[PDB]
């Protein structure tokens, strides 16, 4: 029981984006935020997803 | 000012939790729970090595 | 609960009870989007304690005195256990010095 | 059997001693950004005291209490043909009433928008802020179009 | 009748002997007191170097038992943001560590 | 051995409720999300890989 | 050191009649030699442990 | 000092004996000295106060 | 002998748990730039089960 | 001219803020004068000359 509640919480944290009322962003922006942490993105039309 | 006052607040509860005289309230928070966990290992290293 | 093992704990008066995982709040990587975002504003300080053992009181034993209790002729039977004492006494000596 | 007890304990103390040396180098002397290594929370400084056969660490960390809601915008578009993003991914541009400010995402530290806070890119996204060169003085106060 | 002593060996020679007794045993001509044991050696005590070490004790090349001082370093500092005279590294050298 | 594991297993409702196939869009994470309880009486079960 | 400790355990009598398994059967009858060999078996399994 | 007295004063377990006290034996040997007569030597701790 | 196996087993498990807790904090809850700690390449996100 | 990250190819239009002024020129720098610097930084208008 506790493991399913442990791994489940960790999996769903990727959808969090620090928004008001914790409304989840589309997951493409969770990936895009994590790409910016590598290098500052300039592809704004977002073809590579 | 709040950062200094809060640090003084926590730094005193650490001493009270080490002595254990605040026993009925040591479980009131996670910050004091780490003190209990520390006392649990320091208990073991003293009672087992002999 | 004051004593715990696995999912079972017992509180002060002796009642057994199931344990709940500790509730926390995971952090989130703030996204680059035109929308409403929440940013930490008002800060408080906390102190968290951690203990780590860095040494263990080393003990060395003499393989001859412990076994033969200083008896003279017992030594000339233990010496036929050629590799016994050196294994015991080097394993303790080298660990202490390192 | 006694030697078996000692070698097993030396295995543990050796593994825990390495972690103590790491925490002296990375939490006490230095300031760490590794998550959870020097305590749950944002690390500031640490203290160390002697303990029976070991050390005790007092990790001083920050935990947030309140949050602020801000109308953030992804970027800027000027004349519809020139796009700007922020120079650091950890910064955010947000509106405060009738003017724009720039803040960090880890801590709320308001900043007046300088032109050096931005990086020019070769396309716009439509969801950017929509202004003209005659109006960039309302977002970046120092900007004054000299060619115009 | 014969409790165990500990001999000290360095570079295949014997240099000292931890003793429980006020004698000049094993031919060493100089005896010194320590908090929990006598110590005998041919040390001159004109020495300050440590080739062997245990706990807070150590021995010279001639077998003089000395206390090991903690080794000296210069801790780095977080250069503060302040209007003052600061000091900044200017010259550099290369060091290799094994 | 039990205390080490019990401190590690933390939980968060605010994020657990987002462990869903809808929260990830084109990224098919269906084989790892917790299974819906077949007959209630537990919060979740093993995933398609667990 | 571990291998030398292990190979030295093979000269142990373990208070059997002799350290050589073949020598026991050269000296004793089968119903009596089994009770002597069993000491060497138990002792040498302790050496491997 | 609290973390050195709040815990049990285990003087009957591991204690680095005064070897020079034991062999003169003006009084009946202590526990630390009795272990020394059996070859067990507890060395002073490396974590010097 | 049984206690020896159990104690030796808990030593390896404790070290493997300590590494697991590090990787939960640094590869799952965060994005790592430590090379070779969360894959051989540019880490993006991690999942746990 | 363009500017890109070394970790990932992300093209960028050179703004004057992308540079840092230093005391000396290397024999390998781009050889340019203030009047025609606009070919490297499109938005730079020489407000002295
Ligand atoms: C890193 O390790 C090196 C050890 O190789 C440390 O460097 C050495 O540190 C000592 C203590 O600070 C220096 O001694 C000093 O020398 C000057 C000049 O004689 C004297 O005025 C001081 O009172 C002291 O004796 C030593 O010169 C220095 N140099 C070298 C080349 O090793 C270093 O401190 C360590 N650094 C850190 C940040 O841990
Ligand atoms: C995401 O991944 C899951 C697997 O974890 C995909 O579910 C699987 O989809 C296949 C293809 O539909 C299913 O197999 C076939 O299903 C049909 C309809 O039941 C049946 O007629 C065929 O005989 C065959 O079984 C497979 O059973 C299913 N597995 C599970 C565990 O649900 C899912 O479709 C993927 N979704 C997306 C949007 O990528
Ligand atoms: C770090 O530790 C603190 C506890 O000191 C956690 O904060 C608690 O979170 C729970 C979540 O349900 C709240 O109910 C408590 O009121 C919080 N208390 C305090 C004192 O902070 C926190 O969640 C932990 N993690 C992080 C990332 O901050
Ligand atoms: C411009 O950037 C924003 C994100 O900052 C994009 O917003 C969402 O992006 C996905 C594609 O990754 C779209 O499917 C969504 O429709 C967008 N959100 C909303 C609420 O509509 C935006 O689409 C980006 N521009 C383009 C062309 O993809
Ligand atoms: C900024 O201006 C542009 C150009 O007028 C807007 O882009 C158009 O938006 C409308 C809907 O508002 C669409 O029907 C058009 O197709 C868009 N243009 C193109 C070329 O696709 C953009 O919406 C404006 N954005 C803001 C935030 O004001
Ligand atoms: C700055 O100039 C130095 C020379 O002063 C450059 O070094 C030269 O690099 C070329 C590369 O093809 C070699 O052929 C030369 O033989 C090098 N000369 C010397 C003296 O090393 C250096 O590469 C330049 N540095 C930068 C940062 O651009
Ligand atoms: C930029 O201009 C400088 C100076 O005119 C050039 O450096 C000269 O290169 C010639 C090559 O034959 C040498 O003879 C001179 O001695 C150099 N001058 C100095 C002051 O060192 C440089 O080569 C030019 N570089 C580029 C990339 O155009
Ligand atoms: C954690 O929060 C949940 C919210 O549903 C609550 O039911 C549970 O009792 C809480 N447990 C603890 C230990 O705080
Ligand atoms: C952001 O907050 C404003 C009020 O400050 C509100 O009008 C708006 O609906 C909020 N949400 C979004 C998604 O814009
Ligand atoms: C910040 O936190 C402290 C907590 O005691 C509070 O007194 C203070 O009013 C809060 N707000 C600001 C704006 O400082
Ligand atoms: C040890 O004996 C010497 C003479 O051999 C004497 O000077 C010294 O005081 C004695 N020390 C102790 C501690 O008994
Ligand atoms: C120690 O010094 C004495 C001084 O008389 C000398 O006789 C002896 O040979 C030296 N060496 C040893 C190993 O005792
Ligand atoms: C000890 O050694 C130093 C260095 O060789 C020497 O100068 C000194 O005179 C010696 N003697 C004493 C008594 O310090
Ligand atoms: C370190 O410095 C102190 C004085 O600051 C000195 O007494 C000591 O001898 C030095 N350390 C060593 C190992 O020599
Ligand atoms: C810096 O130090 C110099 C010399 O000590 C002194 O003249 C100067 O006023 C100092 N300035 C400040 C800001 O402390
Ligand atoms: C650094 O020190 C060396 C001597 O070790 C000196 O020759 C050199 O000029 C110094 N560096 C500078 C930039 O002055
Ligand atoms: C996913 O969300 C939908 C709607 O809340 C629900 O029907 C479904 O059971 C959820 N599944 C999981 C595994 O959370
Ligand atoms: C100024 O504007 C004119 C018209 O767009 C253009 O020809 C010229 O290149 C611009 N120059 C600069 C330095 O921006
Ligand atoms: C502009 O450059 C000229 C070059 O001759 C110089 O005279 C003048 O001082 C510069 N302008 C300013 C404001 O310094």
Say how far apart CA C30 and CA D103 lie, in whole Å: 12
Q: In terms of CA atoms, which chain C residue is nearest residue D20? A: C52
Q: Which two three-digit tokens encode residue D121?
A: 């890119």
CA dihedral E59, E65, E67, E70 (to 10 degrees): -10
Distance CA J33, CA A29 (A): 42
Q: Which two tokens stand for residue E70?
A: 């903690």
Resolution in Å equals 3.2
Residue E4 has which token pair?
A: 């165990």
* Residue D116 in tokens: 């050096």
Pick D83's closest partner by Cβ from A18, A36, A44: A44
Q: Give alpha helix (H) positions in B1-50.
A: 2-19, 30-48
- Counting CB pairs under 8 A, whether chains C and B reach 3 or more, is yes
Are E85 and E67 spatial neighbours (Cβ–Cβ below 8 Å)? Answer: no
Local structure of G14: helix, strand or coil: coil
Strand residues in chain C grouped as ranges (E) = 3-5, 8-10, 16-18, 22-23, 36-53, 59-61
Contact assessment for residue D106 and residue D90, using Cβ atoms and an 8 Å cutoff: yes
CA–CA gap between residue A15 and residue D103 (Å, rounded)? 23
Distance CA B13, CA D111 (A): 38
Return d(Cα I36, Cα I32) in angstroms, integer: 10
Give the separation between CA D22 and CA H29, rounded to whole angstroms.
44
3-state DSSP call for residue E13?
strand
CA–CA separation, D105 vs A23, rounded Å?
Answer: 17
State the Cα–Cα distance between residues C97 and F35, nearest whole angstrom: 54
- Closest listed residue to residue D133, CA positions, set D91, D84, D72, D71: D84
Binary contact (I13, F32; C-beta < 8 A): no
Sort strands H40-42 and C59-61 into parallel, antiparallel or unpaired.
Answer: antiparallel
**If you measure from the C-alpha of residue D24 to the centroid of ligand 14, how many angstroms do you get, rounded to a whole number?**
21
Q: Please identify which residue in the block is written with the tokens 């984006």.
A: A17
Nearest CA in chain B to C1: B27
Q: What is the DSSP annotation of F12-33?
A: -HHHHTT-SSGGGTTS--TTTS
User: The sheet that has E13-19: what strands, in order across it?
Assistant: E6-10, E13-19, E37-41, E30-34
The whole-angstrom distance between C46's CA and the closest CA on chain E is: 21
Of A18, A33, A44, the CB nearest to D125: A44
Contact (Cβ atoms closer than 8 angstroms) between residue H27 and residue D75? no
Across the interface, whether the CB atoms of A42 and D85 are under 8 A apart is answered yes
Sign of CA dihedral E60, E66, E70, E72: negative
Contact (CB<8Å) D50/H45: no
Contact I15 D19 (CB under 8 A): no
Both tokens assigned to D61: 């960390």
Q: Is F36 in the pocket of ligand 17 (CB under 6 A)?
A: yes
Instruction: DSSP letter for G24, please.
Output: H
CA distances from C58 to C98, G2, J7 (A): 11, 22, 51
Inter-residue contact C32 to D128 (CB < 8 Å): no
B11: contact with C, CB 8 A cutoff: yes
User: For E39, phi and psi rounded to 5 degrees?
Assistant: -145, 135
Where do we find the tokens 């965060």? I30
- Answer yes or no: are the C-beta atoms of B36 and C50 closer than 8 Å: no
> What separation in angstroms does the CA of A16 have from each of A13, A33, C84, C88, D92?
5, 11, 62, 57, 17
| Residue E9 near residue E15 (C-beta atoms within 8 A) | yes
Method: cryo-EM
Residue E69 CB less than 6 A away from ligand 14: yes
- Residues contacting ligand 5 via CB (< 6 Å): D 80, 126-127, 130
- What is the rounded distance in angstroms from the CA atom of residue A7 to the CA atom of residue F32? 9
Neighbouring C-beta atoms of residue A36, cutoff 10 Å: 19
Nearest one of J44, F11, J38, G46 to C20, comparing CA atoms: F11
Tokens representing D65 are 């209490």
Identify whether the C-beta of residue F18 lies closer than 8 Å to the C-beta of residue F32.
Answer: no
Q: Interior CA angle at D61 toward D57 and D66, to 5°?
A: 155
């Amino acid at each position: 029981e506790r493991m399913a509640m442990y791994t489940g919480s960790l999996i769903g944290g990727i959808a969090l984006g620090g928004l008001t009322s914790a409304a989840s962003i589309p997951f493409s922006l969770a990936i895009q935020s994590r790409l910016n942490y590598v290098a500052l993105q300039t592809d704004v039309l977002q073809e590579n997803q | 000012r709040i950062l200094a006052a809060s640090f003084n607040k926590a730094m005193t509860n650490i001493v009270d939790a080490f002595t254990g005289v605040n026993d009925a309230i040591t479980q009131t928070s996670q910050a004091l729970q780490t003190v209990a966990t520390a006392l649990n290992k320091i208990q073991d290293v003293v009672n087992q090595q002999g | 609960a004051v004593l715990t093992y696995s999912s079972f704990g017992v509180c002060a008066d002796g009642s057994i009870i199931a344990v709940q995982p500790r509730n926390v709040s995971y952090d989130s990587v703030s996204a680059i989007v035109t929308a409403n975002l929440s940013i930490p504003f008002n800060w408080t300080t906390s102190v968290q304690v951690e203990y780590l053992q860095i040494t263990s009181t080393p003990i060395v034993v003499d393989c001859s005195t412990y076994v033969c209790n200083g008896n003279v002729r017992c030594v000339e039977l233990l010496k036929q256990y050629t590799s016994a004492c050196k294994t015991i006494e080097d394993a303790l000596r080298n660990s202490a010095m390192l | 059997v006694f030697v078996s007890h000692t070698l097993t304990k030396y295995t543990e103390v050796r593994a825990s001693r390495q972690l103590a040396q790491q925490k002296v180098n990375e939490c006490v002397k230095s300031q760490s950004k590794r998550y959870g290594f020097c305590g749950n929370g944002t690390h500031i400084f640490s203290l160390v005291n002697a303990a029976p056969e070991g050390l005790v660490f007092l990790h001083t960390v920050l935990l947030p209490t309140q949050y602020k809601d801000v109308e953030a915008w992804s970027g800027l578009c000027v004349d519809g043909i020139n796009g700007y993003v922020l120079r650091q991914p950890n910064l955010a541009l947000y509106k405060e009433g009738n003017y724009y400010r720039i803040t960090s995402r880890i801590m709320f530290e308001p900043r007046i928008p300088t032109i050096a806070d931005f990086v020019q890119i070769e396309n716009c996204n439509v969801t950017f802020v929509n202004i003209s060169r005659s109006e960039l003085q309302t977002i970046v106060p120092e900007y004054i179009d000299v060619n115009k | 009748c014969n409790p165990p002593d500990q001999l000290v060996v360095y570079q295949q020679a014997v240099v000292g002997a931890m003793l429980s007794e006020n004698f000049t045993s094993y031919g060493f001509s100089n005896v010194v007191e320590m908090p929990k044991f006598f110590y005998a050696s041919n040390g001159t005590y004109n020495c300050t170097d440590a080739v062997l070490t245990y706990s807070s004790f150590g021995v010279c090349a001639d077998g003089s038992i000395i206390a090991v001082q903690p080794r000296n370093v210069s801790y780095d500092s977080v250069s503060a943001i302040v209007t003052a005279n600061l000091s900044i590294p200017f010259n550099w050298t290369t060091s290799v560590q094994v | 051995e039990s205390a080490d594991v019990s401190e590690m297993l933390t939980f968060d409702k605010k994020a657990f409720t987002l462990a869903n196939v809808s929260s990830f869009g084109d990224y098919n994470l269906s084989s790892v999300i917790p299974s819906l309880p077949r007959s209630g009486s537990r919060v979740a079960g093993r995933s398609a890989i667990e | 050191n571990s291998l030398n400790h292990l190979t030295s355990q093979l000269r142990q009598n373990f208070q059997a009649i002799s350290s050589s398994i073949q020598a026991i059967y050269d000296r004793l009858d089968p119903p009596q030699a089994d009770q002597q060999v069993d000491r060497l078996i138990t002792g040498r399994l302790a050496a491997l442990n | 000092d609290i973390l050195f007295s709040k815990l049990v004063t285990s003087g009957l377990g591991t204690v680095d004996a005064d070897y020079k006290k034991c062999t003169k034996g003006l009084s009946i040997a202590d526990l630390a000295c009795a272990q020394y007569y059996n070859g067990i030597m507890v060395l002073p701790g490396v974590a010097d106060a």
